[PDB]
Amino acid sequence: KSSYYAPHGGHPADRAMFTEAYAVIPKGVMRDIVTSHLPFWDNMRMWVIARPLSGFAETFSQYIVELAPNGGSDKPEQDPNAEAVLFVVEGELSLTLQGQVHAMQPGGYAFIPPGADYKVRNTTGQHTRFHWIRKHYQKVDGVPLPEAFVTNEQDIQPLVMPDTEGRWSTTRFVDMSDMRHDMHVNIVNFEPGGVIPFAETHVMEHGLYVLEGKAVYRLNQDWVEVEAGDFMWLRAFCPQACYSGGPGRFRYLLYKDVNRHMRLTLN
Amino acid sequence: KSSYYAPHGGHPADRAMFTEAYAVIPKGVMRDIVTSHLPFWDNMRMWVIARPLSGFAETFSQYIVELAPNGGSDKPEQDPNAEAVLFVVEGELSLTLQGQVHAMQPGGYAFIPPGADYKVRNTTGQHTRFHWIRKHYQKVDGVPLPEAFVTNEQDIQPLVMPDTEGRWSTTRFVDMSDMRHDMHVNIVNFEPGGVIPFAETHVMEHGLYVLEGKAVYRLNQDWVEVEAGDFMWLRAFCPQACYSGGPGRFRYLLYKDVNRHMRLTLN
Amino acid sequence: KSSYYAPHGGHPADRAMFTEAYAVIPKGVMRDIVTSHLPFWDNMRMWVIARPLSGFAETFSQYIVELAPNGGSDKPEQDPNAEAVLFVVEGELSLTLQGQVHAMQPGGYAFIPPGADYKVRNTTGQHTRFHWIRKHYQKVDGVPLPEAFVTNEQDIQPLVMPDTEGRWSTTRFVDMSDMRHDMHVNIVNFEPGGVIPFAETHVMEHGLYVLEGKAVYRLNQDWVEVEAGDFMWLRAFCPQACYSGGPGRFRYLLYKDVNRHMRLTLN
């Protein structure tokens, strides 16, 4: 059973980087007095992680939602063109997607298509913490909307990357040829093996959220230590290298937009 | 009775910082030959403080309005979706909000909902100076528009922050659970006590305007001196720390957007 | 009779600066193989000076138009909401504004309101060179559109700035209280006197184009030499200082937006 880091808050007693090619935001930012709130939610506090760097960072939104016992919402998503992914990192979540109910345990993944009616609720007596990644779905003629689904990463055999003595792999939730999806939320895995000189999986901007382990990542000529809870944002073409030395597995959640044309100025 | 700094101009006889994570604009910028003007205003000169840094800084607008005796306007706001907050820092202001008149003294706060009809006027024989913070209100189904109100900070007991030996507190004007509001204009207070390692109250971009005192603020790995009149703008996740050593109280006006989803590119 | 620098091109045989607060583009950029072209123009080559720095620099457009003898256009402006200013720096220009014809000599200034029908032509046997500054006019209820007019700077007595031993002045073309105008295209003049510690005339972004003389300008903590032909762009709050030491007068064309509210994100 894999373990995932989850923000708790507390009263604890800097590595925040902001460059022209990338940004690094340590977990130490996840404080109580900095949480946000959304309308129509009961017993809920979340941390927002969006617009890490100025510029083209309005494609995705990411929240780390915390639900107190008996918390949740019956009207979670207000935006109709918002597609999303649910990833539980701690506790149990009750998702009612399309009238279908699902008991999500840590490692639970769920893809909610735009417009779909759903609702979440924590019916346990313990706290439940999960990730919420949204994006305005990009429709395209001939390509039908993507279909919802609920699975668990622990049930998906990671696809081993052809290199680095097979120490590096990825866990996907959708077929690479599925043009119905316009975004991928995968988990990149690194064994405590050696050095991966080229760890880039996407050429355009995307975010990386460490879920477990420790490692010295190389963000464009710059080496920086990161651990479970830290977040990274890459502008584009931003070089990527990984030196996993931790005794355990080093993995991070990753989201990016794909299978679509590049946005052009409507001049 | 608390005192607030207010720009006067004069002919006085650099600390302006612009980084990738934050910006600092000293009060020495508030000069006569740099003031602005708005249509339909009588005897009025204001200083604009917006777009401190390039990028995502078009959410808020801030003006420090100066009204000469018998000055003001009967058609102050032209934008119908503009919500605002009025904060008098010197002199007396006569606000006619929703047909209701109010005599605002220094420390006067007022929330004007979008579309509301109001009008300001300085009926005294002295100059009146106040802050004007606007923003396009974000409507949301089921959540009714926020209701206007006029109060005075000196009449609001500051909420003491759970830390730093209770040397740090905040003065709010709206309930934290009030989903009707999409922006908060509060006053962060710092006692001449010790060092506050984590002074961040918002994770996304927001502005800070010092109203009183002096202090060495820590803007992301960078320590910079600030005093009443100086303004600070933080990109996002921009680390925050405060070392109030002044013999008196150190406080700054603060505005940020909240209780809403993060803006997503309409692709 | 005042003289103005004008780009010629030729085959001549670096000081280009780009910072987070300002930009400096030397005249040496005005080369033949880099000129641009607009539809419906006869015998014309122009140099574009826009978007000097990334971000909020799409408010204004500036072209330095060169007309060969018997050149010009009967359909110069295609954009209907584009207001403009014409400033001849060399040669004679024939402007037909609103059916009215004008013979513009060097120093000729002209304000063309949005939608107005006009047309330019060089009816001389010599080359004519002028500046073209455009902007989408911002209409506002109760405030009628601005009225056209043609004058010459050499006929406008500069307004002396209250400071620096009256060594610094400005030449305006519109009344400061004229809410009909949403942009000012003035000429800032500096006598070979002393040092002007505060030379900022606008708080928000604006452009400076040197027309004559030489001087060591201070762009936010940074001193840089500039001369007739050089262009400067300031982000906002960008500190400004001037040390005119040239034996003659140092002056630069200046454009900025004013008398209107600050643009707010339509969220």
Next chain:
Amino acid sequence: KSSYYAPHGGHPALLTDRAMFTEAYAVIPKGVMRDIVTSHLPFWDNMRMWVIARPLSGFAETFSQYIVELAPNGGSDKPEQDPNAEAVLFVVEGELSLTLQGQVHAMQPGGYAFIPPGADYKVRNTTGQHTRFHWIRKHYQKVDGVPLPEAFVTNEQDIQPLVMPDTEGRWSTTRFVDMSDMRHDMHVNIVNFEPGGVIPFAETHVMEHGLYVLEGKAVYRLNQDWVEVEAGDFMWLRAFCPQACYSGGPGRFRYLLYKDVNRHMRLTLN
């Protein structure tokens, strides 16, 4: 009574470090003083010390500072080998026994001792507890007509600090030698900052000199750069380096300071 920080070593086990090295200054955190980085000297029994010299390249070989830890029965009968070396002993923890000029002194924490060049002396730890002191060295500069400085022992807690004529008496200095005594070519004082306000000009020497925070915390400004410093941290200044202080701590903020004075500036020989 006054407190003084003293290294203990050890090897305690994500964060970077406040260590700095610029062209005007160098900041060295207390976390450097580890066990495996200690040094030793001939003829010393049960002794371990932390060296702090040459903080930055260039003209930084005038002074030498050590933080010596003597275990019970530790010390030496031939402490100094250099006949031109002058010194200042400052105990921060424990009790040191100094035999200087045929006079035995029982030094308690706070104890200050000045040893003139070539002076015979010896140190010993006669207690059952460890002792820790600072040892500042420099080659004494002899000037004709001026006699060598005479030794002496005392405790800073017995010296009334000379209050600076400003900042509402929130800044003072404790000296151990008369500013007019031309026999001394170096001063080792303690700068005291009350939890008061700001100190825009805290520079006390124009040339290079070291600062060792004995107690407290504060936001110090070293040439355009504000840095938090606490007891145990060492700051090295190059020359003309601006110094501003912002001592806001609840208690007193103070540091040991050493500099060379009352002499001509050394000029290259040709």
Next chain:
Amino acid sequence: KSSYYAPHGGHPALLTDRAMFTEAYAVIPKGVMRDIVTSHLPFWDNMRMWVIARPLSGFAETFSQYIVELAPNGGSDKPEQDPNAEAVLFVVEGELSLTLQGQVHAMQPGGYAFIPPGADYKVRNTTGQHTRFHWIRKHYQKVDGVPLPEAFVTNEQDIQPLVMPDTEGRWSTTRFVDMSDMRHDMHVNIVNFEPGGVIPFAETHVMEHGLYVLEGKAVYRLNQDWVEVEAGDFMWLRAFCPQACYSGGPGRFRYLLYKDVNRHMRLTLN
């Protein structure tokens, strides 16, 4: 008559500072000259001085400059202790009494005096008002066949400045020694800039040397960096450091300059 800036000390009480330290130069503002940062020398009565040496690390120990303030009756009968030290005295305020080579000179502000190595002399303030002068020191380099330079006293106001062959005569230099006099191994002149225009090449020495602004203000360019400087500021140049000047002030802008010349370059010994 000509004016000259002179420190007075004091301790005047938000702004940073123009102090700079780069790899090519160092700028030191007049605001450094405070009271608590003054120095002293043996055998000097009623004297306080501001030291200005080793502006930057490395090869910067050739010269030594002091700004001495003598109170009434102040001075010394054994001013120099170094037999190889040569000097140049330049009074900026008050009247100094110099006894050089069995000749007493009444020096008024502007007074320039050259003291050869090992030369006996003495200085005294016989007036009721304080006096302030600059004292530049250097070890003289003896060369076989060349006799030691002879002393002399004069006033710069009596010396016609040699105008530079350019910039429309808006730049000149006042010298106190014949450029061909190989007996001198150092020059201490005053560079004069008229309120004229620009000076793209203001470098007068290729190797390191100091500049002390005596009067005026200007925008000086030190290696790709423009910096405003005024009377009292000191600039130190490393070597080959580009120098451009932009003196636009209403009055005259000028600075005292010292450099070593007419000798071979010092080579490491092996």
Next chain:
Amino acid sequence: KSSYYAPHGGHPALLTDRAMFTEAYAVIPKGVMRDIVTSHLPFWDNMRMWVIARPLSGFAETFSQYIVELAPNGGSDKPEQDPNAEAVLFVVEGELSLTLQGQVHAMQPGGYAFIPPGADYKVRNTTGQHTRFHWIRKHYQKVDGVPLPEAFVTNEQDIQPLVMPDTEGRWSTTRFVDMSDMRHDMHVNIVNFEPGGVIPFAETHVMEHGLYVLEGKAVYRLNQDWVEVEAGDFMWLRAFCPQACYSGGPGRFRYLLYKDVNRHMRLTLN
């Protein structure tokens, strides 16, 4: 058996370079060791060496390191010309024949030899294959009462490394001299890092010292800067420079290290 990297020269033929020079450290890649950049010494037959001294300006003239390549029959009968020079020979490839103190030693790769100041010795390559060794030099500092260190020869593979009390025994050090032996004023050890985890504090000396990676690869942290290093790379540390290591390689990561110790800090003479 243990492996050791050894330069071979050559001139192999788009990429920049890992060479660094900061104010706290200097990294020198193995790619510097080219053929046309080799050096020579008098009285040496069939010898070529790569010099590695003065990595950075300032206080960096204490040690000298050479990487000597002797062709068959190469060597010398008058290897050292400096009577005060002490040395340490460390063969990395081939077999060296050392005659030290009237004792001939057949040194195999891994062979360590300490030669005391003024000691007579000679080196020769009696095999048909080339040999390569490191030669570290330093002027020995004599201290009265302490006798000169005695020579000795051995092989590091025969020395059990002293494991650091932490990091689960993933970090150790091999020493060739007793830490208490005050006769030695310098140590040349080998730091060993197991492919284990992180090492937040890898500093073993507080003052300046050199590091030469003999085997392995790792991500080393030199003052706020992480840099990949491999066998053949050399790192020079200034002082107090923070050191963190991240040896994740499949094999062992280790480097030769030399530093000066057990002596007083050198103070300018006046």
Next chain:
Amino acid sequence: KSSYYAPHGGHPALLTDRAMFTEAYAVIPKGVMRDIVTSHLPFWDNMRMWVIARPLSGFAETFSQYIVELAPNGGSDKPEQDPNAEAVLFVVEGELSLTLQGQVHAMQPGGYAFIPPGADYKVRNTTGQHTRFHWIRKHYQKVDGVPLPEAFVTNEQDIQPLVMPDTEGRWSTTRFVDMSDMRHDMHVNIVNFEPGGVIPFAETHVMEHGLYVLEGKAVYRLNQDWVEVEAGDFMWLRAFCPQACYSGGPGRFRYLLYKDVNRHMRLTLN
């Protein structure tokens, strides 16, 4: 025939400057060589020279280079005053008359002369036209058993350049001394780059050394930094500083280079 650039001075009258000063190198443009920045030496008639020494702080006092301009009848009968100074004369314009070792040589541009330490000689300009040459100085290091180097005169145009074994023979070097001649402790050669292609590794010395472009232009890479250089420009390298060259000019690109070799590395004395 070959051409060589030679300063002429003058004072020609918006652009910055290619002058650089980093922690690894220093670039000095030809535009520095102005008239008012020239130097002088005792016992020299009708002589003016441009000094180029101490380009950067630190270990940069080994060599001294001058560019001497002798007017007709100019020169000296006591040119060198330092008995340990060795030299290399390289005429770039005009004709110089050198009397070395009781042998008069008529040196034409391209003329190379090596003067051993303490050697008597003299230079004179017997023509009606000015003459210009380079004078490189260094204290010679004597080593027991090795005799002093013998003088000699020749012209580089008569020396066949040793082509580097690569880059298709587009890179070569002209030497004036046998690489095995241990009597010389310094080499002054000329590096020749054909208008060919790139040179990823142009470093010819590992330690510090100077480069003076005699002819051509090129884009040289000094430690991660590409800089355009032309005849008259001087580049100073610190050590291990990477060197890459991109000579694309229509003609030949070449520079005079001087470095110290065949000797042990200087170690601090203790």
